[PDB]
Amino acid sequence: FLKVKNWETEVVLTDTLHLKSTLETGCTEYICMGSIMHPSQHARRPEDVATKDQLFPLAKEFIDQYYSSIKRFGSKAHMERLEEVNKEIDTTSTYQLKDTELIYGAKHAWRNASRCVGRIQWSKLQVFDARDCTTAHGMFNYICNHVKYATNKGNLRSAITIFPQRTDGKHDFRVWNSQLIRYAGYKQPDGSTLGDPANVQFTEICIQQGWKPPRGRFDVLPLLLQANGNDPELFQIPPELVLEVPIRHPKFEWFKDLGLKWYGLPAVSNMLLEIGGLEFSACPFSGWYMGTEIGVRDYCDNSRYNILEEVAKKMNLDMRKTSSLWKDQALVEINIAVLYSFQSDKVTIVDHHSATESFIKHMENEYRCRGGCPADWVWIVPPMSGSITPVFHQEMLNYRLTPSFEYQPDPWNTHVWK
Amino acid sequence: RFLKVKNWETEVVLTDTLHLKSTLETGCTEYICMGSIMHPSDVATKDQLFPLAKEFIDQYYSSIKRFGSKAHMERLEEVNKEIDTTSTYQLKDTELIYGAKHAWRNASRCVGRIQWSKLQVFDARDCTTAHGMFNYICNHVKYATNKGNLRSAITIFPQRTDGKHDFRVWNSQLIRYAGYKQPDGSTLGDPANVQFTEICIQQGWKPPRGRFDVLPLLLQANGNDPELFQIPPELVLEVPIRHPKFEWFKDLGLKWYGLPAVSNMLLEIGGLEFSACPFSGWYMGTEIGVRDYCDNSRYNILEEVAKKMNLDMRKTSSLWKDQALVEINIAVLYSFQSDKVTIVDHHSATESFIKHMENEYRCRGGCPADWVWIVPPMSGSITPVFHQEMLNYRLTPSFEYQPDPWNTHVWKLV
Ligand code: HEM
Ligand code: HEM
Ligand SMILES: Cc1cc(N)nc(CCCN2CCC(F)(F)CC2)c1
Ligand SMILES: Cc1cc(N)nc(CCCN2CCC(F)(F)CC2)c1
Ligand SMILES: C[C@H](O)[C@H](O)[C@H]1CNc2nc(N)[nH]c(=O)c2N1
Ligand SMILES: C[C@H](O)[C@H](O)[C@H]1CNc2nc(N)[nH]c(=O)c2N1
Ligand SMILES: [Zn+2]
């Protein structure tokens, strides 16, 4: 057993769930790697098509967990399912999940995501089974339906669309975009960057593939979709499906003249979903924003839109020295504007005070019913005003449970073109 | 073996080899990370002390480029004699200074370590009574305060012997404000110090019962009962807090003390334990402006400031707390700078820490750093440390936490 304490409330929780952790964290009793982005390469199954003794134990573990979850461990259906999975692996080197298992696996991958502050919502996830997809055109159709469903005219709904699992590693389905909706970035001749600097490389691949860039500050990128290991294909998302919020400020009438906007739907498309040894390399999922993701990171990171200087100028702050806290002062006003703007357009958004309070409640729920909740303090604490949120004062234990979402390489680093 | 850390803002990659020198526990395991746990988890025998002493003497003679020398070998022989005959040993003055500086250098939770080699070390190992401790501490406060031009310093009292004769400063810091619980459930002064305030009162302290009463010193020598002393008021430098634009801010009546002086930690050098070792530097503004003033469990002034700012406090999404938090921290920095009392803002402090970290990697092979503590409690991602991967491990000499003395002390009077 392990205890975590909240230093504000003195609430103490006792963790037993960590006994079921599967993968290394990267830490040891002599070194802590808690602030490393990718601390571990420990995987549950090796590189490509596993042998029977490598895959079946992982499948058995997941099926056991699923049938335990529904109070049917050792039931007739449980033992038949094991026999069935055994024959599938025997004859195809893989196996196929039932619809119920796929849904259970996706929801638990979200429930197990230690870096996600939004998990109080984990059981309210709409799962779209796209495992019958065969072409990039079919992927585009599935993604359009996902975006329209999840956007829901601003009343956002969490969703995941799951394309065919990896087979041999040469027939991967991939969304080359990091998110379904991102803005292009362009290297300028004078050395600067127009648009989102984070997407410069992906933007160049799109242009190189035939995309005609309008070369503005907020150009929605095309989709670059790879089916069954083939070369990726470009598609324009119909603009009526792309909900955007123009950013204005409730007090500063000049703020609108900065010309800022953002999109409403955060839709991660570069991660891998791992369920029982199966690897779903294309599994775009979406929820709704916490305001700081846009107002602190997207807008104010030095390597992103980097707007602090512009905003502080318009505010007439003393920008001569750091100790005037002009960056901090502008940072708050920018984040007021983002929240005010989404709320004014009735687009779902959560501020970091409400989000972190919900997460503390979610932790307490999980310790009561599940005996723990894996949580990564470095990622859960918001990137502004940290200690005036309750999660700053909350001790957390981090460990890796399966099913899970994993990072994977960018496909342009691995794809051999045809 | 090597380990790489990356900065995701700059893409600089640093290579850590120094971590191979750790041999004490982080608290984590191969399958669980406890990096956000505040405290993960009588005296050394002869056999335990031998290898600890050797490792320290070895590293000291290596630092002065005398490893393997005649002097090195004779020092090791001398140390082993003392352990064999007395069950402990005594550091040379050079070794004490080196060890104190390196405990600071090794403090993975400290963002101010670019200053580590400029530490003034006061050797107080000849002290025998609480009155002598009081004298040493007054001299430290006066030296460190230096009329506002603060200088880092540490004063080292005699090491633990059998654990029954410990020297302890019972205060958590040398200068702190009292807190008083009221019958109606409210608190006057600093809520963090209510418990220590009660102990002082019970020992005979007559409290003024104000909002900013400087606490007396409660000093324990040689395992005896602790004794009360009033710090001479002219040695306590304080800064009234005002704001460069809001003339009403001074009406809040806020002030703080200039000298941050930690007195409840333990200094370990070569297996020796210095249970009383108060040390001091200068403040980073957020320590006062974010934590001391705006923690819900501390002075908790966000509401009053947001009121006077005419902020909309009905909804969290107005970010009224965030807005008030920034102005309070502007006031703290402005006030200290106007009074010419050393202070550093979190932007300057984290920039210097990154420079320090890179230098340490280049010349030492690494820099143990605790991201959870290094990143400031406000505006985290607009400081460079937020984007810097770090490795946390325990090197010795080190500063350690220890139990509060009133939880272990067995009283003697009547
Ligand atoms: C419903 C509202 C949601 C909110 C407010 C939310 C919030 C967040 C935030 C703020 C982060 C940190 C992201 C960053 O700093 O870049 C995060 C990470 C994460 N979220 Fe959630 N999230 C939500 C829904 C979801 C859903 C539906 C899923 C999956 C089905 C999910 C899976 C994850 C994962 C795996 C991570 C960490 C991996 C990574 O981003 O590198 N989240 N979340
Ligand atoms: C010179 C200016 C210094 C600055 C600006 C500075 C800054 C800081 C800050 C902001 C913290 C976190 C404190 C907290 O959040 O409660 C810290 C922790 C720490 N500091 Fe430094 N510090 C300085 C000097 C020193 C000195 C002189 C020593 C010892 C010789 C020292 C040893 C430590 C240790 C051991 C910790 C972590 C242990 C703990 O506080 O729980 N620091 N420092
Ligand atoms: C579903 C969702 C909701 C939300 N509110 N925010 C996010 C942001 C995730 C950002 N995360 C960055 C690292 C990565 F790119 F590798 C994977 C995605 C996702
Ligand atoms: C020397 C110094 C300088 C500075 N600028 N700030 C500090 C703050 C240390 C706070 N830390 C809290 C936990 C503890 F009480 F156990 C030990 C002290 C210390
Ligand atoms: C639970 C969490 O570890 C705790 O609140 C820590 C977070 N980081 C901190 N960082 C600093 N500098 N000081 C602190 O007291 C804390 N508290
Ligand atoms: C190195 C460090 O871990 C890295 O900058 C992390 C810090 N915490 C974070 N937290 C969130 N939510 N998102 C991030 O991208 C990061 N980046
Ligand atoms: Zn760890």
mmCIF file with all atom_site columns, C-alpha atoms in Angstrom, chain B residues 92-234:
data_model
loop_
_atom_site.group_PDB
_atom_site.id
_atom_site.type_symbol
_atom_site.label_atom_id
_atom_site.label_alt_id
_atom_site.label_comp_id
_atom_site.label_asym_id
_atom_site.label_entity_id
_atom_site.label_seq_id
_atom_site.pdbx_PDB_ins_code
_atom_site.Cartn_x
_atom_site.Cartn_y
_atom_site.Cartn_z
_atom_site.occupancy
_atom_site.B_iso_or_equiv
_atom_site.pdbx_formal_charge
_atom_site.auth_seq_id
_atom_site.auth_comp_id
_atom_site.auth_asym_id
_atom_site.auth_atom_id
_atom_site.pdbx_PDB_model_num
ATOM 1   C CA . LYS B 1 92  ? 38.567  19.584 9.157  1.00 0.00 ? 92  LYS B CA 1
ATOM 2   C CA . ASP B 1 93  ? 37.435  23.167 8.529  1.00 0.00 ? 93  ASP B CA 1
ATOM 3   C CA . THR B 1 94  ? 38.219  22.833 4.807  1.00 0.00 ? 94  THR B CA 1
ATOM 4   C CA . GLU B 1 95  ? 36.073  19.687 4.667  1.00 0.00 ? 95  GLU B CA 1
ATOM 5   C CA . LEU B 1 96  ? 33.191  21.345 6.525  1.00 0.00 ? 96  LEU B CA 1
ATOM 6   C CA . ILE B 1 97  ? 33.128  24.267 4.084  1.00 0.00 ? 97  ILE B CA 1
ATOM 7   C CA . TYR B 1 98  ? 33.371  21.959 1.068  1.00 0.00 ? 98  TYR B CA 1
ATOM 8   C CA . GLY B 1 99  ? 30.624  19.753 2.471  1.00 0.00 ? 99  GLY B CA 1
ATOM 9   C CA . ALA B 1 100 ? 28.225  22.606 3.227  1.00 0.00 ? 100 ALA B CA 1
ATOM 10  C CA . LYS B 1 101 ? 28.674  24.118 -0.244 1.00 0.00 ? 101 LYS B CA 1
ATOM 11  C CA . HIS B 1 102 ? 28.130  20.737 -1.876 1.00 0.00 ? 102 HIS B CA 1
ATOM 12  C CA . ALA B 1 103 ? 25.009  20.001 0.141  1.00 0.00 ? 103 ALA B CA 1
ATOM 13  C CA . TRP B 1 104 ? 23.621  23.186 -1.413 1.00 0.00 ? 104 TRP B CA 1
ATOM 14  C CA . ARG B 1 105 ? 24.964  22.257 -4.862 1.00 0.00 ? 105 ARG B CA 1
ATOM 15  C CA . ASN B 1 106 ? 23.251  18.883 -4.460 1.00 0.00 ? 106 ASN B CA 1
ATOM 16  C CA . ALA B 1 107 ? 19.859  20.286 -3.322 1.00 0.00 ? 107 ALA B CA 1
ATOM 17  C CA . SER B 1 108 ? 17.673  19.117 -6.188 1.00 0.00 ? 108 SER B CA 1
ATOM 18  C CA . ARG B 1 109 ? 14.688  21.235 -5.062 1.00 0.00 ? 109 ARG B CA 1
ATOM 19  C CA . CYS B 1 110 ? 16.620  24.551 -5.014 1.00 0.00 ? 110 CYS B CA 1
ATOM 20  C CA . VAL B 1 111 ? 16.362  26.895 -8.015 1.00 0.00 ? 111 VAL B CA 1
ATOM 21  C CA . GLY B 1 112 ? 18.973  29.276 -6.601 1.00 0.00 ? 112 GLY B CA 1
ATOM 22  C CA . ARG B 1 113 ? 21.992  26.998 -6.912 1.00 0.00 ? 113 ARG B CA 1
ATOM 23  C CA . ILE B 1 114 ? 23.897  29.131 -9.458 1.00 0.00 ? 114 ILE B CA 1
ATOM 24  C CA . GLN B 1 115 ? 25.139  30.810 -6.235 1.00 0.00 ? 115 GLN B CA 1
ATOM 25  C CA . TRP B 1 116 ? 26.279  27.572 -4.541 1.00 0.00 ? 116 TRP B CA 1
ATOM 26  C CA . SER B 1 117 ? 30.009  28.305 -4.431 1.00 0.00 ? 117 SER B CA 1
ATOM 27  C CA . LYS B 1 118 ? 29.401  31.684 -2.723 1.00 0.00 ? 118 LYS B CA 1
ATOM 28  C CA . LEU B 1 119 ? 28.295  30.452 0.684  1.00 0.00 ? 119 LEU B CA 1
ATOM 29  C CA . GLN B 1 120 ? 29.675  31.965 3.870  1.00 0.00 ? 120 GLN B CA 1
ATOM 30  C CA . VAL B 1 121 ? 30.181  29.116 6.364  1.00 0.00 ? 121 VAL B CA 1
ATOM 31  C CA . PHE B 1 122 ? 30.226  29.876 10.110 1.00 0.00 ? 122 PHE B CA 1
ATOM 32  C CA . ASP B 1 123 ? 31.749  27.044 12.164 1.00 0.00 ? 123 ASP B CA 1
ATOM 33  C CA . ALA B 1 124 ? 29.805  26.830 15.440 1.00 0.00 ? 124 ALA B CA 1
ATOM 34  C CA . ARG B 1 125 ? 30.965  23.353 16.458 1.00 0.00 ? 125 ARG B CA 1
ATOM 35  C CA . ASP B 1 126 ? 32.464  24.765 19.694 1.00 0.00 ? 126 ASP B CA 1
ATOM 36  C CA . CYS B 1 127 ? 29.006  25.812 20.963 1.00 0.00 ? 127 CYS B CA 1
ATOM 37  C CA . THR B 1 128 ? 27.722  24.200 24.174 1.00 0.00 ? 128 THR B CA 1
ATOM 38  C CA . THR B 1 129 ? 24.628  26.101 25.373 1.00 0.00 ? 129 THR B CA 1
ATOM 39  C CA . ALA B 1 130 ? 21.478  27.720 24.051 1.00 0.00 ? 130 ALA B CA 1
ATOM 40  C CA . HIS B 1 131 ? 22.876  31.162 24.924 1.00 0.00 ? 131 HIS B CA 1
ATOM 41  C CA . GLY B 1 132 ? 25.848  30.448 22.667 1.00 0.00 ? 132 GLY B CA 1
ATOM 42  C CA . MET B 1 133 ? 23.507  29.322 19.895 1.00 0.00 ? 133 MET B CA 1
ATOM 43  C CA . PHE B 1 134 ? 21.614  32.610 20.267 1.00 0.00 ? 134 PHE B CA 1
ATOM 44  C CA . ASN B 1 135 ? 24.882  34.541 19.856 1.00 0.00 ? 135 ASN B CA 1
ATOM 45  C CA . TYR B 1 136 ? 25.906  32.574 16.753 1.00 0.00 ? 136 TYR B CA 1
ATOM 46  C CA . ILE B 1 137 ? 22.450  33.079 15.233 1.00 0.00 ? 137 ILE B CA 1
ATOM 47  C CA . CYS B 1 138 ? 22.401  36.833 15.873 1.00 0.00 ? 138 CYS B CA 1
ATOM 48  C CA . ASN B 1 139 ? 25.796  37.122 14.191 1.00 0.00 ? 139 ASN B CA 1
ATOM 49  C CA . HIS B 1 140 ? 24.529  35.088 11.217 1.00 0.00 ? 140 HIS B CA 1
ATOM 50  C CA . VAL B 1 141 ? 21.405  37.250 10.849 1.00 0.00 ? 141 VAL B CA 1
ATOM 51  C CA . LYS B 1 142 ? 23.438  40.459 10.968 1.00 0.00 ? 142 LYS B CA 1
ATOM 52  C CA . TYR B 1 143 ? 26.031  39.156 8.497  1.00 0.00 ? 143 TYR B CA 1
ATOM 53  C CA . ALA B 1 144 ? 23.482  37.751 6.061  1.00 0.00 ? 144 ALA B CA 1
ATOM 54  C CA . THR B 1 145 ? 21.139  40.762 6.160  1.00 0.00 ? 145 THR B CA 1
ATOM 55  C CA . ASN B 1 146 ? 23.959  43.265 5.503  1.00 0.00 ? 146 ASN B CA 1
ATOM 56  C CA . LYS B 1 147 ? 21.533  46.260 5.493  1.00 0.00 ? 147 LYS B CA 1
ATOM 57  C CA . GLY B 1 148 ? 19.554  44.728 2.593  1.00 0.00 ? 148 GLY B CA 1
ATOM 58  C CA . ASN B 1 149 ? 22.425  43.552 0.379  1.00 0.00 ? 149 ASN B CA 1
ATOM 59  C CA . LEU B 1 150 ? 21.815  39.944 1.318  1.00 0.00 ? 150 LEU B CA 1
ATOM 60  C CA . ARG B 1 151 ? 24.632  37.371 1.504  1.00 0.00 ? 151 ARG B CA 1
ATOM 61  C CA . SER B 1 152 ? 24.136  33.598 1.672  1.00 0.00 ? 152 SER B CA 1
ATOM 62  C CA . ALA B 1 153 ? 25.363  32.003 4.892  1.00 0.00 ? 153 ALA B CA 1
ATOM 63  C CA . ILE B 1 154 ? 25.109  28.867 7.028  1.00 0.00 ? 154 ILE B CA 1
ATOM 64  C CA . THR B 1 155 ? 26.003  28.304 10.683 1.00 0.00 ? 155 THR B CA 1
ATOM 65  C CA . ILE B 1 156 ? 26.877  24.742 11.664 1.00 0.00 ? 156 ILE B CA 1
ATOM 66  C CA . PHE B 1 157 ? 26.355  23.582 15.267 1.00 0.00 ? 157 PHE B CA 1
ATOM 67  C CA . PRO B 1 158 ? 27.874  20.392 16.765 1.00 0.00 ? 158 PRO B CA 1
ATOM 68  C CA . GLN B 1 159 ? 27.042  17.097 15.098 1.00 0.00 ? 159 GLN B CA 1
ATOM 69  C CA . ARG B 1 160 ? 24.824  14.391 16.529 1.00 0.00 ? 160 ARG B CA 1
ATOM 70  C CA . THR B 1 161 ? 26.576  11.965 18.855 1.00 0.00 ? 161 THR B CA 1
ATOM 71  C CA . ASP B 1 162 ? 24.260  9.378  20.434 1.00 0.00 ? 162 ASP B CA 1
ATOM 72  C CA . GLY B 1 163 ? 21.001  11.056 19.362 1.00 0.00 ? 163 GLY B CA 1
ATOM 73  C CA . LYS B 1 164 ? 20.285  11.997 22.999 1.00 0.00 ? 164 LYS B CA 1
ATOM 74  C CA . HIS B 1 165 ? 22.311  15.234 22.869 1.00 0.00 ? 165 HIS B CA 1
ATOM 75  C CA . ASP B 1 166 ? 21.094  16.866 19.643 1.00 0.00 ? 166 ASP B CA 1
ATOM 76  C CA . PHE B 1 167 ? 21.428  20.557 18.914 1.00 0.00 ? 167 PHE B CA 1
ATOM 77  C CA . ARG B 1 168 ? 18.190  21.836 17.367 1.00 0.00 ? 168 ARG B CA 1
ATOM 78  C CA . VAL B 1 169 ? 16.681  25.139 16.357 1.00 0.00 ? 169 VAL B CA 1
ATOM 79  C CA . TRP B 1 170 ? 13.014  24.485 17.077 1.00 0.00 ? 170 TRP B CA 1
ATOM 80  C CA . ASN B 1 171 ? 11.920  27.295 14.726 1.00 0.00 ? 171 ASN B CA 1
ATOM 81  C CA . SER B 1 172 ? 11.336  26.260 11.137 1.00 0.00 ? 172 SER B CA 1
ATOM 82  C CA . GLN B 1 173 ? 12.953  29.509 9.967  1.00 0.00 ? 173 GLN B CA 1
ATOM 83  C CA . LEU B 1 174 ? 14.980  32.007 11.982 1.00 0.00 ? 174 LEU B CA 1
ATOM 84  C CA . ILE B 1 175 ? 12.459  34.782 11.226 1.00 0.00 ? 175 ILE B CA 1
ATOM 85  C CA . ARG B 1 176 ? 8.739   33.952 10.961 1.00 0.00 ? 176 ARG B CA 1
ATOM 86  C CA . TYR B 1 177 ? 5.501   35.545 12.082 1.00 0.00 ? 177 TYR B CA 1
ATOM 87  C CA . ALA B 1 178 ? 3.302   34.138 14.822 1.00 0.00 ? 178 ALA B CA 1
ATOM 88  C CA . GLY B 1 179 ? -0.158  32.757 14.270 1.00 0.00 ? 179 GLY B CA 1
ATOM 89  C CA . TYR B 1 180 ? -2.958  32.733 16.815 1.00 0.00 ? 180 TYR B CA 1
ATOM 90  C CA . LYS B 1 181 ? -6.161  30.740 16.570 1.00 0.00 ? 181 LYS B CA 1
ATOM 91  C CA . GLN B 1 182 ? -9.128  32.783 17.810 1.00 0.00 ? 182 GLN B CA 1
ATOM 92  C CA . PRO B 1 183 ? -12.153 31.458 19.735 1.00 0.00 ? 183 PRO B CA 1
ATOM 93  C CA . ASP B 1 184 ? -14.370 32.138 16.704 1.00 0.00 ? 184 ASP B CA 1
ATOM 94  C CA . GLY B 1 185 ? -12.244 29.874 14.488 1.00 0.00 ? 185 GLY B CA 1
ATOM 95  C CA . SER B 1 186 ? -10.376 32.640 12.675 1.00 0.00 ? 186 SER B CA 1
ATOM 96  C CA . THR B 1 187 ? -6.581  32.960 12.731 1.00 0.00 ? 187 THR B CA 1
ATOM 97  C CA . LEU B 1 188 ? -4.536  36.085 13.435 1.00 0.00 ? 188 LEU B CA 1
ATOM 98  C CA . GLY B 1 189 ? -1.119  36.247 11.797 1.00 0.00 ? 189 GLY B CA 1
ATOM 99  C CA . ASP B 1 190 ? 0.405   33.332 9.905  1.00 0.00 ? 190 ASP B CA 1
ATOM 100 C CA . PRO B 1 191 ? -1.701  30.123 10.082 1.00 0.00 ? 191 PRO B CA 1
ATOM 101 C CA . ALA B 1 192 ? 1.348   28.029 9.162  1.00 0.00 ? 192 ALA B CA 1
ATOM 102 C CA . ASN B 1 193 ? 2.937   28.843 12.518 1.00 0.00 ? 193 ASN B CA 1
ATOM 103 C CA . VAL B 1 194 ? 0.014   28.320 14.911 1.00 0.00 ? 194 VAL B CA 1
ATOM 104 C CA . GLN B 1 195 ? 1.480   25.151 16.414 1.00 0.00 ? 195 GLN B CA 1
ATOM 105 C CA . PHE B 1 196 ? 4.954   26.571 16.999 1.00 0.00 ? 196 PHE B CA 1
ATOM 106 C CA . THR B 1 197 ? 3.352   29.745 18.376 1.00 0.00 ? 197 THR B CA 1
ATOM 107 C CA . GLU B 1 198 ? 1.488   27.688 21.011 1.00 0.00 ? 198 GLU B CA 1
ATOM 108 C CA . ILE B 1 199 ? 4.715   25.965 22.083 1.00 0.00 ? 199 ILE B CA 1
ATOM 109 C CA . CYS B 1 200 ? 6.460   29.318 22.556 1.00 0.00 ? 200 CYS B CA 1
ATOM 110 C CA . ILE B 1 201 ? 3.558   30.701 24.601 1.00 0.00 ? 201 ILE B CA 1
ATOM 111 C CA . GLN B 1 202 ? 3.605   27.606 26.813 1.00 0.00 ? 202 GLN B CA 1
ATOM 112 C CA . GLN B 1 203 ? 7.356   28.116 27.356 1.00 0.00 ? 203 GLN B CA 1
ATOM 113 C CA . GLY B 1 204 ? 6.687   31.620 28.725 1.00 0.00 ? 204 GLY B CA 1
ATOM 114 C CA . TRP B 1 205 ? 6.565   33.874 25.657 1.00 0.00 ? 205 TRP B CA 1
ATOM 115 C CA . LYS B 1 206 ? 4.289   36.881 26.133 1.00 0.00 ? 206 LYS B CA 1
ATOM 116 C CA . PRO B 1 207 ? 2.776   37.391 22.662 1.00 0.00 ? 207 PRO B CA 1
ATOM 117 C CA . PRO B 1 208 ? 1.743   40.822 21.357 1.00 0.00 ? 208 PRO B CA 1
ATOM 118 C CA . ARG B 1 209 ? -1.140  39.186 19.429 1.00 0.00 ? 209 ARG B CA 1
ATOM 119 C CA . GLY B 1 210 ? -0.686  41.080 16.182 1.00 0.00 ? 210 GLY B CA 1
ATOM 120 C CA . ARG B 1 211 ? -0.675  40.119 12.529 1.00 0.00 ? 211 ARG B CA 1
ATOM 121 C CA . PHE B 1 212 ? 3.113   40.244 12.093 1.00 0.00 ? 212 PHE B CA 1
ATOM 122 C CA . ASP B 1 213 ? 4.707   39.327 15.430 1.00 0.00 ? 213 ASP B CA 1
ATOM 123 C CA . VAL B 1 214 ? 8.263   38.111 14.901 1.00 0.00 ? 214 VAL B CA 1
ATOM 124 C CA . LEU B 1 215 ? 8.510   34.829 16.778 1.00 0.00 ? 215 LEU B CA 1
ATOM 125 C CA . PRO B 1 216 ? 11.182  34.259 19.442 1.00 0.00 ? 216 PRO B CA 1
ATOM 126 C CA . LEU B 1 217 ? 13.985  31.765 18.961 1.00 0.00 ? 217 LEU B CA 1
ATOM 127 C CA . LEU B 1 218 ? 13.535  28.394 20.691 1.00 0.00 ? 218 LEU B CA 1
ATOM 128 C CA . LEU B 1 219 ? 17.016  26.880 20.888 1.00 0.00 ? 219 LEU B CA 1
ATOM 129 C CA . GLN B 1 220 ? 18.095  23.428 22.123 1.00 0.00 ? 220 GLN B CA 1
ATOM 130 C CA . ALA B 1 221 ? 21.725  22.656 22.989 1.00 0.00 ? 221 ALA B CA 1
ATOM 131 C CA . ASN B 1 222 ? 23.205  19.259 23.811 1.00 0.00 ? 222 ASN B CA 1
ATOM 132 C CA . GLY B 1 223 ? 19.802  17.562 24.111 1.00 0.00 ? 223 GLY B CA 1
ATOM 133 C CA . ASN B 1 224 ? 18.715  19.873 26.945 1.00 0.00 ? 224 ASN B CA 1
ATOM 134 C CA . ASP B 1 225 ? 15.272  21.483 27.098 1.00 0.00 ? 225 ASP B CA 1
ATOM 135 C CA . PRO B 1 226 ? 14.976  24.377 24.610 1.00 0.00 ? 226 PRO B CA 1
ATOM 136 C CA . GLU B 1 227 ? 15.180  27.979 25.763 1.00 0.00 ? 227 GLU B CA 1
ATOM 137 C CA . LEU B 1 228 ? 13.498  31.175 24.520 1.00 0.00 ? 228 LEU B CA 1
ATOM 138 C CA . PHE B 1 229 ? 15.361  34.213 23.119 1.00 0.00 ? 229 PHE B CA 1
ATOM 139 C CA . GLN B 1 230 ? 14.065  37.423 21.511 1.00 0.00 ? 230 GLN B CA 1
ATOM 140 C CA . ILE B 1 231 ? 15.920  38.405 18.348 1.00 0.00 ? 231 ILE B CA 1
ATOM 141 C CA . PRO B 1 232 ? 17.049  42.054 18.751 1.00 0.00 ? 232 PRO B CA 1
ATOM 142 C CA . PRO B 1 233 ? 14.471  43.973 16.717 1.00 0.00 ? 233 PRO B CA 1
ATOM 143 C CA . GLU B 1 234 ? 17.088  46.063 14.914 1.00 0.00 ? 234 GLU B CA 1
#
